[PDB]
Design a protein around this ligand. Sequence first.
Ligand SMILES: CCc1cnn2c(NCc3ccc[n+](O)c3)cc(N3CCCC[C@H]3CCO)nc12
Ligand SMILES: O=C(O)c1cc([N+](=O)[O-])ccc1NCCc1c[nH]c2ccccc12
Length: 275
Amino acid sequence: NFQKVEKIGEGTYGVVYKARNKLTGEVVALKKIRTAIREISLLKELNHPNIVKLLDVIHTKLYLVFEFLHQDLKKFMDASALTGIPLPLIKSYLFQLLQGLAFCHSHRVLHRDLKPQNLLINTEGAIKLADFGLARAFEVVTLWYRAPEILLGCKYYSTAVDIWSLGCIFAEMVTRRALFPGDSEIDQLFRIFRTLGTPDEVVWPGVTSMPDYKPSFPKWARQDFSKVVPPLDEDGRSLLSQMLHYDPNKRISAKAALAHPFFQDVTKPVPHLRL
Ligand SMILES: CCc1cnn2c(NCc3ccc[n+](O)c3)cc(N3CCCC[C@H]3CCO)nc12
Ligand SMILES: O=C(O)c1cc([N+](=O)[O-])ccc1NCCc1c[nH]c2ccccc12
């Protein structure tokens, strides 16, 4: 084979290896997965600083060669759990991720499975989206970041599902605890309901006609964001509240989120990375 190879983890659609090109010496990441071959390959020339670069596509069964990043945000959050990630770095990372989402959404590409392990960081302060759910689009599953319209059975969900996931990640960076740590689809939905209130037609028109909506759902009252992400200042809570709107049509877009006052003082700090 063309590479020398070491496992780094499991994406949603296949296993990921750190590897060195035998002839070139390039250090890269290889994802092994298992027409569509087409639109994936366009993504080689659609590049953004906050999206992981796809280097090559190879089919026998399907290999994807990516640039290599040195840490993922789950490991970085775990490493930072005793002290917390500094607010300026949280804010820089959120801003960068919204830039990546604005870009891919503007090209009508959804991610669909944002989670801390899929967000990759380097020593220079960048963070990049990875592990796009693009294989269906063209070992226990984590539901903690799933938008409620997905859980309620919406077939044709939108770019808003990514804003929801990013909102959950934002909250988790701030509080150092997962916002909605469910272990089943209904447990995930009811954890969301218990925190944000059971949605109704007032806050989410059409929710009661969603495929998996049940009139027998318990009706929980909404608690206040002061309780949900206490340390976060009012600008951060306002932005988070707009990222976690039940109605996908009221939920803030990535482009709109970038203009939120929370980012008026955004900067690009350097993380303390132990590699
Ligand atoms: C795009 C392919 C890729 C490139 N770098 N990289 C990294 N680098 C960080 C890193 C390096 C060395 C050891 N560790 O533990 C982390 C991790 C990672 N992933 C996290 C773990 C689950 C699989 C996979 C998901 C997201 O692609 N995927 C990638
Ligand atoms: O990230 C993955 O694992 C992944 C998986 C599959 N797949 O499984 O078919 C396909 C593509 C993937 N990444 C592409 C990253 C990418 C480069 N330029 C872009 C421009 C817009 C949106 C995204 C990108």
